[PDB]
Scaffold this active site. Structure first.
Site, mmCIF file in Angstrom:
data_model
loop_
_atom_site.group_PDB
_atom_site.id
_atom_site.type_symbol
_atom_site.label_atom_id
_atom_site.label_comp_id
_atom_site.label_asym_id
_atom_site.label_seq_id
_atom_site.Cartn_x
_atom_site.Cartn_y
_atom_site.Cartn_z
ATOM 1 N N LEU A 1 35.626 -20.498 -26.580
ATOM 2 C CA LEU A 1 35.899 -19.343 -25.866
ATOM 3 C C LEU A 1 35.982 -19.648 -24.394
ATOM 4 O O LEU A 1 35.877 -20.852 -23.931
ATOM 5 C CB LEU A 1 35.091 -18.137 -25.984
ATOM 6 C CG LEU A 1 34.332 -17.741 -27.356
ATOM 7 C CD1 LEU A 1 33.181 -18.329 -28.057
ATOM 8 C CD2 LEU A 1 34.546 -16.189 -27.655
ATOM 9 N N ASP A 2 35.922 -18.683 -23.554
ATOM 10 C CA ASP A 2 35.910 -18.913 -22.075
ATOM 11 C C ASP A 2 34.558 -18.293 -21.436
ATOM 12 O O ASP A 2 33.652 -18.028 -22.239
ATOM 13 C CB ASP A 2 36.955 -18.105 -21.425
ATOM 14 C CG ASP A 2 37.493 -18.821 -20.181
ATOM 15 O OD1 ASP A 2 37.028 -19.945 -19.859
ATOM 16 O OD2 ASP A 2 38.392 -18.264 -19.488
ATOM 17 N N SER A 3 34.391 -18.732 -20.246
ATOM 18 C CA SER A 3 33.090 -18.459 -19.418
ATOM 19 C C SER A 3 32.989 -16.869 -19.512
ATOM 20 O O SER A 3 31.767 -16.296 -19.580
ATOM 21 C CB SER A 3 33.231 -18.903 -18.110
ATOM 22 O OG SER A 3 34.252 -18.938 -17.637
#
Ligand SMILES: CCCCCCCCCCCCCCCCCC(=O)OC[C@H](COP(=O)([O-])OCC[N+](C)(C)C)OC(=O)CCCCCCCCCCCCCCCCC
Ligand SMILES: CCCCCCCCCCCCCCCCCC(=O)OC[C@H](COP(=O)([O-])OCC[N+](C)(C)C)OC(=O)CCCCCCCCCCCCCCCCC
Lengths: 128, 459, 70, 87, 101, 177
Positions: free
Chosen positions: D41-43
């Site tokens: 996933l992303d931050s």
């Protein structure tokens, strides 16, 4: 467009809206690194002197005694009477005294000249 | 008054002939016997003072002060018996002898019928307090505390003595049982102005008056606490006795001359309350509160109404007891933490609950909580100063806010909040400490039930 | 029943001081109040009467309570 | 009021919140499954998870400790330390 | 090269280790117990309660109650003979030589 | 800027903290769950539309405009968690966080009331006082010259050796005592 939140004595600028965070000069990180080094030295000293099982006593902070000595005992020896200090002392030392003296004085003459002529109502005033 | 002076001068060899471990017990027991014996002075009549002999008399005014003095000696002996355990036995007996001599000079001060005798022993009291302050202190500034305390007070009274001698050449007698009937009115002239200044300035310094109060905080943040209690509680009352014994002779020139003194006292009590609002030491804060209380007493006796005299005497006794027990609180804190900083040791209610209760009672009695005698005296002075003029109540009102604002704040940062993590030598309550605190507190509550014994000479 | 511990400062000294204060005040307060109610119930408070002719009273014969007279 | 929670209770809670997220498939999750490495996933999704846990447990996690705990096991360890489990 | 050779500064002596029953008076337990008994007997049981009993039954302070009783007589006189309660003249106005005006 | 370990906040961390604070203020603005979810998805979509921007100076200026509108459009009373600072119950239960060394001051007549606990306490204290010299030996050789450069404490590098400076961080009592 947007309201410019002005700086004030009672309303400082936030830590986030200040442009000083967002400058990318090298001495900024150098100063931050040396501040972190100083803080790390102080924190390390506090933790070594504070987690000791043998020590039973107050961790004598030099900053506390330094501030309490600078608050009172170090006012006169570094004082030089100039125009600003003498003017402020004369303004805040004899001003309110003269003001209260004159107010209470003229109140006393008004009350006395009212009471000698019988105009002041003292019908029930027997406790003084 | 030979039935109390001889016990003191006979207890003097008792503290000189006692054993190496029973000095404190014997001195405390015999001083408490003298304290019980001192209750016989209350044989007072509504017209005549109890005139014992030619050179000794005690009206309704000086008797509560005497009872306070020889009740105060055992409290001082308990409050100064911890840190002198490592001190040499001969110097321990020297300290106890100094306290005994101070009590003897104090009781001889309040009952002196002749004003020359009163002056002579009123600054024979100067030697033992100076010796105790300079020798048994704990800082360097105690040396300076021996100068500003001394060279103020004597500089106020070496004129005064001359003025007293002048009265001996004018009236022919300085006796107080005579001068109540031989007193003449004082005319308006520069000579009478300077006589009033000379007769006033010594006890103006000894209250202290604002401007001349610099000797009070510098001589309290370093003293041994026996010296601190005798200075705050009974040694400041010599000015009040000087007022209520001298102001008979200085009429009617006092009425149209004491205006700048009243202005100075009111605005300086406002200033010293404000200085209490921004202090960092417990001892200095209590000393500046004492400066405010004595400025209020100065105004009370300077307006010279009977209600003001009642309030002045009640406020004097109540402030003496309250300031002595506040100094006991500060001494317990300085004993436990070895410093005088207010912000250093915080949140002690989490660790010491009974000292927190004594802190709460001290703070409540400091801000004149009714129906305590502090509120009685403060209220009577408030009404008398409103009778002097209306606008004065404004100059009172702000103070009655400020005299609350620090009085809880000095409690709160010392008792409420997160406790300091790096302090761990907080011992529990010693029974000696709490016994001293209760012996300070219980008479202050008890006198609220029967205030008529401490309501001055004209109740 | 997951009986956990609460760390608290030692209240033995404060309780001992309070017990000693209450015991040492009651040790004389109980006999004093017992004696006071005994003289108030048996010895008896005095009564007001006018001064007789030719008989002066003592200095202690002008007060009401017997303890005040004593 | 406020019954103490064991480590398996908060573990069930954190896996429940992870399983109720659309970006997490309900099969590949574990205690040590890294968000950028195991799941990728992303931050922003990590801060979404942190907000979900903050709203679920009803208390605030500081931003530095929000970005420092990087596995569900780290979340379990931090919650169990802050609530002081196994009393 | 060390200046003014002095013993090291002593630490804060603690009293609850060598004697957990100490009341803060001294080190000997018998001395502590005797001092505690002496102060708690001669300060509370002897001066407070007996002084309170003495000042509670003090014989008519400043004759204040007497100040009622004679006054209770006096109005009882002058309300029965039509006299005024109190007069504006403290002394006799016929027994004073007024100065000339 | 002020951190226990770092001395400079990276622009990524500032962007994440802006996202967290702005979305918390948005949640405090619109109370209901559906409106909060819709506007949160809108804000996430906005940050995603501005996510693909690798220019440092452009993200710098965009952050400055974003902070300015966030301060311009924030609620006066944002929602604060009951244990968070500024909350209704911040440091309320701290009046019962009595430290452990007060158990040193207990009377011996009460130290026999809980014998097993006090025996465990003395053996824990023995463990700590023998580990103290080992942990100060650990710091006295691992610390760089002139003191440490960062405040991050080192771990324990040996089996059986206790963590260094372990006591006063592990000793804090439970939040509900
Ligand atoms: C704390 C420091 C300051 C202290 C200030 C103390 C008050 C200030 C005034 C004190 C004056 C000295 C005592 C005078 C007593 C007079 C009694 C009397 O009846 O006088 C009437 C007599 C009147 O004279 P006579 O009575 O001889 O005359 C007969 C009467 N007639 C006038 C009708 C003919 O007054 C005087 O003789 C002069 C009085 C004033 C004296 C001025 C000099 C002294 C100035 C003050 C110095 C203060 C100390 C400074 C240093 C301090 C230490 C550093
Ligand atoms: C004195 C100056 C120096 C100061 C230091 C002195 C040191 C020495 C001290 C020696 C010992 C103490 C002496 C003074 C004692 C004063 C007290 C005393 O004896 O008073 C006599 C007075 C005497 O009362 P009296 O004056 O009305 O009696 C008249 C006298 N006879 C009886 C002869 C007609 O005692 C009382 O007033 C006691 C009243 C009853 C007891 C109290 C009942 C109520 C208790 C509280 C209930 C709850 C209320 C609500 C609370 C709400 C929350 C706050």
């Amino acid at each position: 467009s947007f309201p410019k939140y002005e700086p004030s004595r009672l309303a400082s600028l936030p830590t986030t809206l200040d442009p000083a965070e967002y400058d990318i000069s090298s001495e900024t990180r150098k100063a931050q690194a040396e501040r972190l080094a100083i803080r790390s030295r102080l924190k390390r000293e506090y933790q070594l002197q504070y987690n000791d099982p043998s020590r039973r006593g107050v961790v004598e902070d030099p900053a506390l005694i330094r501030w309490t000595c600078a608050r009172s005992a170090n006012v006169y020896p570094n004082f030089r009477p100039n125009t600003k200090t003498s003017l402020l002392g004369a303004l805040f030392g004899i001003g309110p005294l003269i003001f209260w003296y004159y107010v209470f004085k003229t109140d006393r003459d008004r009350k006395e000249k009212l009471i000698q002529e019988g105009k002041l109502d003292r019908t029930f005033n027997i406790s003084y | 008054m030979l039935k109390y002076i001889i016990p003191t001068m006979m207890l003097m060899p008792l503290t000189w002939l006692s054993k190496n471990s029973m000095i404190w017990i014997n001195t405390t027991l015999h001083s408490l016997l003298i304290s019980l014996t001192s209750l016989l002075l209350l044989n007072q009549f509504g017209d005549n003072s109890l005139n014992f002999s030619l050179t000794f008399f005690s009206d309704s005014l000086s008797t509560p002060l005497l009872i306070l003095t020889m009740w105060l000696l055992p409290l001082m002996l308990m409050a100064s018996q911890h840190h002198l355990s490592k001190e040499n036995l001969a110097r321990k007996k020297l300290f106890i002898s100094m306290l005994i001599l101070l009590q003897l000079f104090l009781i001889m001060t309040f009952t002196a019928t002749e004003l020359i005798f009163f002056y002579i022993m009123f600054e024979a009291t100067l030697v033992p307090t100076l010796i105790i302050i300079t020798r048994w202190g704990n800082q360097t500034e105690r040396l300076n505390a021996g100068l500003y305390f001394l060279f103020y007070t004597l500089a106020g009274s070496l004129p005064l003595l001359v003025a007293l001698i002048y009265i001996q050449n004018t009236m022919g007698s300085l006796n107080f049982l005579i001068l109540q009937y031989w007193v003449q009115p004082m005319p308006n002239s520069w000579s009478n102005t300077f006589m009033w200044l000379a007769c006033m300035m010594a006890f103006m310094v000894k209250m202290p008056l604002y401007g001349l109060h610099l000797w009070l905080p510098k001589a309290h943040v370093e003293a041994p606490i026996a010296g601190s209690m005798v200075l705050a509680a009974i040694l400041l009352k010599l000015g009040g006795y000087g007022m209520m014994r001298i102001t008979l002779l200085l009429n009617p020139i006092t009425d149209f001359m004491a205006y700048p003194f009243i202005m100075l006292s009111l605005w300086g009590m406002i200033m010293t309350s404000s200085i209490c609002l921004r202090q960092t030491d417990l001892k200095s804060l209590i000393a500046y509160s004492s400066v405010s209380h004595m400025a209020l007493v100065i105004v009370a006796i300077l307006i010279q109404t009977p209600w003001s005299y009642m309030g002045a005497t009640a406020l004097m006794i109540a402030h003496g007891l309250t300031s002595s027990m506040l100094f006991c609180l500060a001494n317990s804190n300085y004993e436990r933490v070895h410093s005088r900083t207010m912000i250093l040791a915080r949140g002690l209610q989490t660790l010491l609950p009974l000292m927190a209760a004594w802190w709460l009672l001290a703070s409540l009695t400091n801000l004149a909580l009714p129906p305590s005698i502090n509120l009685i005296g403060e209220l009577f002075v408030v009404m008398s100063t409103f009778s002097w003029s209306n606008i004065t109540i404004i100059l009172m009102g702000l103070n009655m806010v400020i005299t609350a604002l620090y009085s809880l704040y000095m409690l709160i940062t010392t008792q409420r909040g997160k406790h300091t993590h790096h302090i761990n030598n907080i011992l529990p309550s010693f029974t000696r400490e709490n016994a001293l605190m209760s012996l300070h507190m219980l008479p202050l509550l008890l006198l609220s039930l029967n205030p008529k014994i401490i309501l001055g000479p004209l109740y | 029943g997951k009986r956990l511990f609460i760390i608290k400062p030692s209240g033995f000294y404060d309780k001992r001081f309070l017990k000693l204060l209450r015991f040492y005040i009651l040790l004389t307060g109980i006999p004093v109040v017992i004696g006071i109610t005994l003289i108030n119930v048996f010895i008896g408070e005095a009564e007001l009467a006018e001064i007789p002719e030719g008989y002066v009273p003592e200095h202690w014969e002008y007060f009401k309570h017997p303890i005040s007279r004593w | 009021d406020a019954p103490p929670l064991t480590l398996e209770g908060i573990k069930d809670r954190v896996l429940y919140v992870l399983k109720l997220y659309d970006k997490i498939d309900p099969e590949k999750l574990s205690v040590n499954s890294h968000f950028m490495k195991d799941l990728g996933l992303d931050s922003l999704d990590q801060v979404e998870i942190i907000m979900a846990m903050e709203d679920e447990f009803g208390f605030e996690i500081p931003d530095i400790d929000a970005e420092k705990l990087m596995c569900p096991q780290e979340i379990v360890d931090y919650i169990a330390d802050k609530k002081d489990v196994y009393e | 090269t060390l200046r003014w050779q002095e013993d090291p500064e002593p630490e804060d002596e603690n009293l609850y280790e060598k004697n957990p029953d100490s009341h803060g008076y001294d080190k000997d337990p018998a001395v502590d117990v005797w001092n505690m008994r002496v102060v708690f007997f001669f300060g509370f049981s002897i001066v407070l309660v007996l002084g309170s009993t003495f000042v509670a039954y003090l014989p008519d302070y400043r004759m204040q109650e007497w100040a009622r009783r004679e006054a209770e007589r006096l109005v009882k006189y002058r309300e029965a003979h039509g006299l005024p309660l109190m007069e504006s003249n403290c002394f006799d106005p016929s027994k004073i030589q007024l100065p000339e005006d | 800027a002020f951190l226990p370990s770092a001395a400079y906040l990276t622009h990524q961390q500032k962007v994440l903290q802006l996202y967290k604070r702005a979305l918390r203020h948005l949640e405090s603005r619109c109370v209901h769950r559906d409106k909060y979810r819709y506007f949160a998805c809108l804000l996430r979509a906005r940050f995603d539309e501005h996510k693909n921007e690798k220019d440092m100076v452009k993200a710098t200026q965009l952050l400055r405009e974003a902070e300015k509108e966030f301060w311009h459009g924030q609620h006066p009373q944002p929602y604060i968690f009951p244990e968070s600072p500024g909350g209704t119950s911040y440091e309320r239960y701290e009046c019962y966080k009595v430290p452990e060394w007060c158990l040193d001051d207990w009377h011996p007549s009460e130290k026999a009331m809980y014998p097993d606990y006090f025996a465990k306490r003395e053996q824990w204290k023995k463990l700590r006082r023998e580990s103290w010299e080992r942990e100060v030996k650990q710091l006295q050789e691992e610390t760089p010259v002139g003191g440490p450069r960062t405040e991050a404490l080192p771990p324990a590098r040996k089996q059986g050796d206790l963590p260094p400076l372990w006591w006063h961080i592990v000793t804090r009592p439970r939040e509900r005592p």
